[PDB]
Amino acid sequence: ECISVKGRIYSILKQIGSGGSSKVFQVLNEKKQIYAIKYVNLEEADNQTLDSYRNEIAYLNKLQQHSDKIIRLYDYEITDQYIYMVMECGNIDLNSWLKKKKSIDPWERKSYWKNMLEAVHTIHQHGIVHSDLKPANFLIVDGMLKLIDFGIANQMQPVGTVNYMPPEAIKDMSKISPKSDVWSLGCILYYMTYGKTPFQQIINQISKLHAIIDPNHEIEFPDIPEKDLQDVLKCCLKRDPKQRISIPELLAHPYVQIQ
Ligand SMILES: O=C(NC1CC1)c1ccc(-c2cnc3c(NCc4cccs4)nccn23)cc1
Numbered sequence: 196e197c198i199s200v201k202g203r204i205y206s207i208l209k210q211i212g213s214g215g216s217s218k219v220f221q222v223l224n225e226k227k228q229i230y231a232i233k234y235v236n237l238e239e240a241d242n243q244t245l246d247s248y249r250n251e252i253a254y255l256n257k258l259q260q261h262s263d264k265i266i267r268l269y270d271y272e273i274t275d276q277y278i279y280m281v282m283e284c285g286n287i288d289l290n291s292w293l294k295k296k297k298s299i300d301p302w303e304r305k306s307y308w309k310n311m312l313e314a315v316h317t318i319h320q321h322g323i324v325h326s327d328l329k330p331a332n333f334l335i336v337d338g339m340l341k342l343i344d345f346g347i348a349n350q351m352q353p354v355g356t357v358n359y360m361p362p363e364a365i366k367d368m369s370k371i372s373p374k375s376d377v378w379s380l381g382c383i384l385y386y387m388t389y390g391k392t393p394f395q396q397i398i399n400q401i402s403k404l405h406a407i408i409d410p411n412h413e414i415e416f417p418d419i420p421e422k423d424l425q426d427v428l429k430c431c432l433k434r435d436p437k438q439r440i441s442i443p444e445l446l447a448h449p450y451v452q453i454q
């Protein structure tokens with residue numbers, strides 16, 4: 196099955212994901228190179244979803260310059276009826292990768308953490324708070340993690356996980372701030388160190404959301420060889436966002452600096 200973007204032809208290999216309005220295809224160009232193409236059908240799209248898609252493509256373009264931990268955008272086509280975005284194709288997404296590992300190498304964990312901090316730092320410096328980060332938002336490319344989206348448009352699905360959801364996102368039911376992204380990052384790092392997310396054991400979604408915002412529900416932090424890692428996790432998972440560690444503080448933390 197064939198796709199045309201700005202007169203260039205691509206062969207579809209498989210469907211990576213689907214959204215409401217959109218689909219993402221692993222694709223083959225004329226020179227036998229692999230890409231990922233996102234297609235957005237705008238024919239049935241209110242001004243809201245239209246503007247979210249315009250905002251996403253504008254931010255994705257702007258951010259090309261500012262970090263290589265943001266997904267590469269090679270080309271795009273926008274029309275009143277559709278958007279195509281020709282992007283790099285990753286090896287595998289973080290969620291699938293974590294799912295198949297029994298354990299994570301401390302060095303690999305640290306290096307992926309640095310990638311995530313950098314990517315999220317760079318969107319924050321442009322005024323974007325993702326506010327729904329989770330392992331599926333990161334992608335492995337060249338042994339390096341890249342953030343693939345910004346929380347701006349409706350995101351890709353290959354019921355929803357709420358294991359990474361920040362307290363103040365639950366309280367919007369706007370207190371969402373850059374600290375919200377720190378919480379979610381902490382939850383990913385927590386999974387990478389202890390093998391479970393902090394509230395994985397609580398099966399019922401509503402019960403879990405209550406637990407996420409309840410300060411009397413202690414999160415467990417078993418002692419581990421790496422004391423700096425343990426402190427990162429505790430600082431990320433503070434329920435008061437005022438007391439929760441910031442991205443610049445995480446970038447100067449011993450965990451990422453003392454090697
Ligand atoms: O929509 C995306 N980003 C928003 C800013 C516009 C988006 C979605 C998916 C990908 C992307 C690019 N590459 C992948 C990938 N690669 C692994 C594969 C999975 C299935 C076949 S290959 N898995 C999942 C998602 N991938 C990149 C950007």
Ligand SMILES: [Cl-]
Binds near residue numbers: 269270281
């Ligand atoms: Cl191209």
